[PDB]
Amino acid sequence: TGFHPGIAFTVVRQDRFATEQLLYAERASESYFVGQIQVHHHDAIGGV
Amino acid sequence: AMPFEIEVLLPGELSPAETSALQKCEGKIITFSTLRHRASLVDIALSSYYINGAPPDTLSLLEAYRMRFAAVITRVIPGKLLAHAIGVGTPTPGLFIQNTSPVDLCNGDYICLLPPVFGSADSIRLDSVGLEIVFPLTIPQTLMREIIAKVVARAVERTAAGAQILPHEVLRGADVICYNGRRYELETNLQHRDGSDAAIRTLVLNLMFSINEGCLLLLALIPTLLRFPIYETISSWISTSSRLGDTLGTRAILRVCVFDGPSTVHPGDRTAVIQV
Amino acid sequence: ELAYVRDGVIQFEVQQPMIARDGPHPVDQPVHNYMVKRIHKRSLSAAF
Amino acid sequence: TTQLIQQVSLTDFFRPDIEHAGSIVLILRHPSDMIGEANTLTQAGRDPDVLLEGLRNLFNACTAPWTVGEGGGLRAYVTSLSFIAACRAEEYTDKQAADANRTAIVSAYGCSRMETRLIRFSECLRAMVQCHVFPHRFISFFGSLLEYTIQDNLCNITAVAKGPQEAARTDKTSTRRVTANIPACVFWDVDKDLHLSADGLKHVFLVFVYTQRRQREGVRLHLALSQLNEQCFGRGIGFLLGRIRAENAAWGTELPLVQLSNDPTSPRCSIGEITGVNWNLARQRLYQWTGDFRGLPTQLSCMYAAYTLIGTIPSESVRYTRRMERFGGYNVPTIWLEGVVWGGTNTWNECYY
């Protein structure tokens, strides 16, 4: 009805934006080991 | 060892609509009376189940899905049908099956055939040769008893016409089948009071005449529990009940194994299976 | 013989690469697209 | 060869990074299906809402309480034998192994509402029996744990579903193979109790044991290892469970026709004599027979066990080993079967007589 009950509120909402990131990496800033490929098969709808 | 492949050579003169219909009716299950490497289109057809010159009822179909050999329809080409056996020992490697049932198959369920007891069946009509083909349902083994016990009971209250039991009750209603977190209402938002009961009434009769004689032979033998040969009756009760029960108590034939895919097979959805 | 053809059709067939990953996704498989198009029919006229 | 099965699930009642490989994994039917079966199968004068409350209280502190409904797609699909054993760790005769396993899984798990998770699951299992929604309809054998991968709260499991257990090859830490194993409390070899104990092939059963008195329900499940086949194992169970049978048969549920026909002087009405006017004056001419079969022992009130067959051990002599080995932070006695070949068909047999 438009009656102020002596109380006030502080609203809070959290939004979301899509950005474009810009990354920089130093030379040899990561070591990396690679293993060996291995194959496995298991039947499915129509074939192997 | 090799699979058991069956070659159903389709005739010509099939309408281009019926060929596209058959192009989608693969993964479904068919049965043969005898298992041979080259079948014909009249061994799959509904006319094979005619018992006394008349189409079969639910009881005859339950008795038939036991004595016949099942087979899954694999790839279909414009010329023929190719189907692999199920029960016999075979290495069938691809063996996918589509779900023709108003429930969802979870990964790991066991599957057993059931004739179309409720409502209607999905049948492909080939009016160019004059024969149709009905496909069994693929329901999980857990509901295989609740479904039949709920479609046979419901058909007894409708027999209780004549003030034998109150037909005015709405206290108990909505006989549903809850599975995988979904409620399948059984009345199917319409009234199939006729057509469905007339195709099940023989099973209902054989169960009435067998439960009614169980709670009376016992009372005749032991009167304190609460010219009419008695031993012949003891014999003819067990002989009938034990011969009617195995028809109902069926076992599973496939199992839903699923890699790389979703865990639930919706109604009208494909999935891979293995042989029990 | 343009006035003897019912409809002429050209075809396409494109492929798309994939990226290997790990985690919650299912493993990927290569996709193959097949397409068809159809030629229109027009006309020109002039008179003296 | 073997047959592998794979299933994604949550990690609430199962943590694959802790359970041993080769462990027996169970699957769970959707919870919203128990409500329907409880609304109809419940006996008279017994509230079918105790199950509903004990169910909505279990899942209220298990994971995100939202998306426990119908069509989410992610759900707490699987459990282990150890979890379902430790939630009822006061009903096994070996209290030492039962309590060891229980205190192992209470601490090694998240410990964030984990004690409550074990208590409320037990309350739900208890409440499932007074509503006659028996657990063996909603829990079933999935496979033996072989290979897993996990994320935050999300797991992906591979198990051996059918075929010899030692033929599956994995990337287990020490060796590329794995054998089946179970907690020592759920183990139950029926042949040593029945004095058969012979050398030969065996079966591996999954037997539930219900015990229902009013407000005193108790549910435990064992792993049986017997010589008796699927048909003749209920006898061996009934002879070992002779007390629960009689207790449930009584505390659970809480006509001279052959003589009247031997004389044509008794009142009767032939079938051709049943017409319109004969209706009202028929149900009184004959012999009266009042009474009812209400309030009597039924199959769901006298049931005390339910078991499946899940695999066999086809050796000349079953060699099983009982060793104490840890779930990481705690020691717990396990049992190491050798050479089990998983089977199935998931056919439960109820025992009421």
Distance between the termini of chain D: 40 Å
Number of helices of chain A: 0
Strand fraction of chain A equals under 5%
What is the β-strand count of chain D? 14
What's the oligomerization state? part of a larger assembly
Number of helices of chain D: 9
Helix content of chain A: under 10%
Separation of the first and last Cα atoms of chain A: 70 Å
- Kindly provide the radius of gyration of chain D, computed on alpha-carbon positions and rounded to a whole number of angstroms: 25 Å
Structural class of chain D: alpha+beta
| Global shape of chain A | elongated
How many strand elements of chain A? 0
Strand count, sense and barrel status of the largest sheet of chain A are: none
Strand content of chain D: 15-25%
Compressed to H and E, one letter per element, the order of chain D equals EEHHEHHHEEEEHEEHHHEEEEE
What percentage of residues of chain D falls in helices of 4 or more residues? Answer: 10-25%
Which overall shape of chain D is indicated by the principal axes computed on the Cα atoms?
A: globular
* Rounded radius of gyration of chain A (Å): 29 Å
Keywords (chain B): Capsid protein, Host nucleus, Virion
Organism (chain B): Human herpesvirus 3 (HHV-3)
Pfam families (chain B): Herpes_V23
Protein name (chain B): Capsid protein
What would you note in describing this structure?
This is part of a larger assembly, with two copies of chain A (48 residues), one copy of chain B (276 residues) and one copy of chain D (353 residues). Chain A is 0% helix and 0% strand. Chain B contains seven helices and 16 strands. Chain B is of the alpha+beta class. Helices cover 26% and strands 23% of the residues of chain B. Chain D is 24% helix and 25% strand. Chain D is globular, with a radius of gyration of 25 Å. The two termini of chain D are 40 Å apart. Chain A binds chain B through residues 42-48, and chain B through 93-96, 259-261, 270-272. Chain D: Keywords: Capsid protein, Host nucleus, Virion. Chain D: One of its GO terms (biological process) is viral capsid assembly. Chain D: GO terms for molecular function: DNA binding. Chain D: This is Capsid protein.
